[PDB]
Amino acid sequence: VRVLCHRIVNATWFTNFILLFILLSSAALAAEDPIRAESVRNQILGYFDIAFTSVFTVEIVLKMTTYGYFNILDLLVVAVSLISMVVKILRVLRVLRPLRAINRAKGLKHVVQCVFVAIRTIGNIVLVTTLLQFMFACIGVQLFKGKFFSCNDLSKMTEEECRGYYYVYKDGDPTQMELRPRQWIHNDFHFDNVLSAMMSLFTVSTFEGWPQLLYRAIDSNEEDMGPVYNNRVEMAIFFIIYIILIAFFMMNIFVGFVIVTFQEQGETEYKNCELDKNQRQCVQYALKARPLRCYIPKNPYQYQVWYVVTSSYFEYLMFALIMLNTICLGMQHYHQSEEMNHISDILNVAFTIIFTLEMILKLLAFKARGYFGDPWNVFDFLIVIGSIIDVILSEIDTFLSAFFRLFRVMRLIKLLSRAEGVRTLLWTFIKSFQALPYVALLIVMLFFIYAVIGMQMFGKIALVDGTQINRNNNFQTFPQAVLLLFRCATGEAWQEILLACSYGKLCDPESDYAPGEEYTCGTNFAYYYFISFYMLCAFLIINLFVAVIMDNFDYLTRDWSILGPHHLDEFKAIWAEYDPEAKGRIKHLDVVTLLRRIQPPLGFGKFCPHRVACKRLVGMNMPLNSDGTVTFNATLFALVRTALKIKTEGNFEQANEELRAIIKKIWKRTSMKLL
Amino acid sequence: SIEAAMKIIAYGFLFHQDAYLRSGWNVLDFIIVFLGVFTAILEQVNVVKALRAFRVLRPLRLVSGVPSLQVVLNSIFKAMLPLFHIALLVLFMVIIYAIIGLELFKGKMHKTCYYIGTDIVATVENEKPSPCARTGSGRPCTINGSECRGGWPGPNHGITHFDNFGFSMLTVYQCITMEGWTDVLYWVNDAIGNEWPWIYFVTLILLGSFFILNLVLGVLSGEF
Amino acid sequence: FYWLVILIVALNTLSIASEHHNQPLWLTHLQDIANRVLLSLFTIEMLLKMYGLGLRQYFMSIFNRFDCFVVCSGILELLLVESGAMTPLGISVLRCIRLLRLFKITKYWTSLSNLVASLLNSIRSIASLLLLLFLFIIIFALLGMQLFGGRYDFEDTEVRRSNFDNFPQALISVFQVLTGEDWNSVMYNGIMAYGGPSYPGVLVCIYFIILFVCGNYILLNVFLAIAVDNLAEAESLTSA
Amino acid sequence: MSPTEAPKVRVTLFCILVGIVLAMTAVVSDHWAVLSPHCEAAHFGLWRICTKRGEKNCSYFSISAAAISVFSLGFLIMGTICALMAFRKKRDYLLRPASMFYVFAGLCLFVSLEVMRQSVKRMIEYYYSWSFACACAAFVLLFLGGISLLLFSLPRMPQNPWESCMDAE
């Protein structure tokens, strides 16, 4: 019936129920063993691939009884699923399971589209480097065609002489040598046709292995001959012009295209109103603020301890003891003396006692409710407790763990609470990663899709040592494949991993292969895999960087000359020394004596205030409530209304006209700033 | 030198050769000339080879001689005032990770596999020398007829390790550049096992490289 | 006519492309046809413009400056062979000069000409950043000659090709460190060129850190003061 | 009421109520190793060592792990007294001191786990079935139900210049 099939699917218990299977269906691909289809792991995960795939079949029939672009893939994920239970390609398109999540999440629905918009925009510029890549690839075929062959020993210059056996000499020793066959070998990247030449030049544009191609090209001599040492050293000009043209200028004129044309995403709308962006970043702060806590205590015994700690000499003492602990931690080294190994045991018990005494005194002076409310004291409470334990746990070692020694290193981070300019730079970028999580979600997905396909296509290469597929760098588990991919994103000999993955490799013996089929591992799909991954990733990472730089562009052009939130940030602290808690108003006996402490962009100047500061505070618009009751969310609009936005009279409610149309929504308590 | 002579006496005395001094560019010109005669005499009397390398300061007299190149270095130096809070963040981050590495990996990469009875390090033909372990989490040294003993100076002729604060800080700066950082990861795996130390390395390459470059780039965008 | 110049534009490009090693003899000879035929057809599209709409106007276009040198240097090479003067060094240089014939598709883009309109008026601003950058490379290349030239005399048998022995090679070595590519291997050779991993000779390494950090600082003032300030004025000139 | 009566902080605090007992399941059960010579089959733990061929001979001898897991139990004790008292009297700040002890109680099993592995490695095979994967599910519970409770009780990032960390109310 169209009414029980309509209400079950719709609200909340169908979206948090099917998506928690998509996340678990995807984790079933990752947990697969690549080498053996016969594992007891690999058997029992196929029975979840019949447990999920009966549930998503319910999702189709419960949907296709309701109605008559993104659901034709959901029919593909079901149809491949029952089929897969070419068979080799019907396993590979079983990776499309996280793609039905980017339809159900509407935060995901949009960020995939913004990529596709930025793909069509960058296309014309892309054509120009694509034609430039072809122009250079043809120059390289005319320079280096047939010239990247060589022999095993460098004595033999033609293929006809490169026969038989020669001696290598281990450890450079002419007494110690072994016999090997000589062989006429071709360089893996060459300029022999135009298409290989584009592959060689793509590698040099990633900067990977480009001096290896450079010294091969300087040594090139004639067609079908081996290299001659420092033959044509002037062929560095070909490689250096290509790097300046492609790998620098073109790449830059691709990034700076995104930056200016992501400015338009914050500039394609039009604002001919009364108040501009700097009036916007100033008014709304006074509207939407909130007073805060200055946990000033009472009880002059507690105030005797409170006046010590918040003072400058206690902030100066404790930050000069973190410096000396950092120096004592730097002094440790390997094979050190007995009176040196233990003075990092004497002082580290000494530094622990000193920071455990500052934690106690801040409980006693700050009225211990008011200690844990401050976030940098929760961090200091965890360094205290974690370094009490390591002093005990090392003491209990010798009386009868390298993790708890880390707490010692962590105290260094405290120093960043004095630095306002580093902590403001840190917050501004950390929040912008936090605010835009789906742009980074895509990168996670790209790695995930690639790692499952890499395990399916490369996971049976043997881990032989001296090659690029080995115990440290393979596709045989999901953590390993992912790690290998990250290495490539970093571009850390990614083209040499690419060559270790093509056709003709040794399969590991625990693979299922016929006798006489050992070298049948690997595929020449590796070329599409690696280049594509390399290219998808570059787009993904620049996309994320420029989306984060967008978020904080008001800060990245904040122009500290004129005005900023920092004058405003400083103001709250001054106000907070008049309030035990928020409460709205303070007395009036502090409203005259307020204006002596503020910067002349916001307060007044250095000079004699008997003209300006005595009359203008009444002379400007201020609210008129009762005598000693004036509040924080009413002055702080008007207090910056001196610094900018001078007006004429009668139109004080014509402040509130542009406080709705050029403004956002209601801001209900704004009768305070009006009169 | 006669240029430095005819440009103090076309002006006058000491406070007129201070008018030769007040601009910072001629300050560069006089340290070169004095230094130039300071090595050319001490070379003759010693009849110096390390003071010869200061002659490469002479091509910087050519930027004092082109006026349209003195407007760039000023604007080059001007862009460094926005990027100082970043450069102090990068610095303390290399200090954090260097010390952690020192505690965690200090003296750990000193055993390689050798030929039995000998002082000859055993490798495969394309393999570089890496740490071993005996009966633990590391790699077991299984080439052929080899055993591993700990008398080895380390992974790149004894350069890249975490034995003291200076060499730990050089291997961390080298990783933060993204050049050779997976060699150092793989060597630590070889020495002590592959279960934990990727957490050290991936976190450094993500904060110390990628996150740092988003802020440096951001500052550049703000300036331009 | 906007679809029948691309017959010889995409025949010439294709002709250039099929060049490969150990290629058939008919393929080399089919490329003897396309060089003679299309150079005559390159004349017919060019002789019609200088006489059919005015030789004064024909020089006024910027790509019609380019059209003449295609013919004037292409038929020059055919007269260079057919005189007994095949000139074995000039047989492969001039086959890179006819590689400018696939630069004739610039008249077909009409999409990024506001950049090159803009890029062009800024070449007295392009070279002032690129001179002091190349001046920076020269000073570090000569400094590496004083520090490391003559010093890589190892009694190994391995080759250390990025060294500081000549000025051209020293120059090649500095640019390699500026890209970052394998810059630590260059630094490992310079530390072993002094004593090795010991307290005076390890301070070699600060040469390489200053060249990497201060050098790539100039690169981000070069290619970002270009591609922000030269790629926003095109955005201004397109929005006008 | 906003950091202490939100459901996202009580789903986590009930999750710690699972890991408070699974780490107690491990610290009494001695089943996380199998000596297998081939009968001399022994099952190791912290407190008792029992060799089974009934001939059930359980006795003591391991000291490191035992001593280390007094602290893993103890922090669990010291964190809850902060957590049980932070749901009353309108102090949710008090909730903050308590979480730190659940990371520590998490990490003082992970030393224990590493300490028990050495005993089986120095001493014939090894197999863990009942109480290593118990404590490796109470490590991962307490270590990650502690860090998430921390970030579900630290205020956030203001996301605005006006907003301030530890901002009033």
Ligand SMILES: COC(=O)C1=C(C)NC(C)=C([N+](=O)[O-])[C@H]1c1ccccc1C(F)(F)F
């Ligand atoms: C087609 O160009 C290409 O082959 C590319 C080469 C040869 N090198 C690399 C590293 C690219 N890539 O995938 O990032 C593109 C490239 C490069 C510079 C600017 C732009 C692009 C562009 F392709 F993204 F446009």
Ligand SMILES: [Ca+2]
């Ligand atoms: Ca590299």
Ligand SMILES: [Ca+2]
């Ligand atoms: Ca590189």
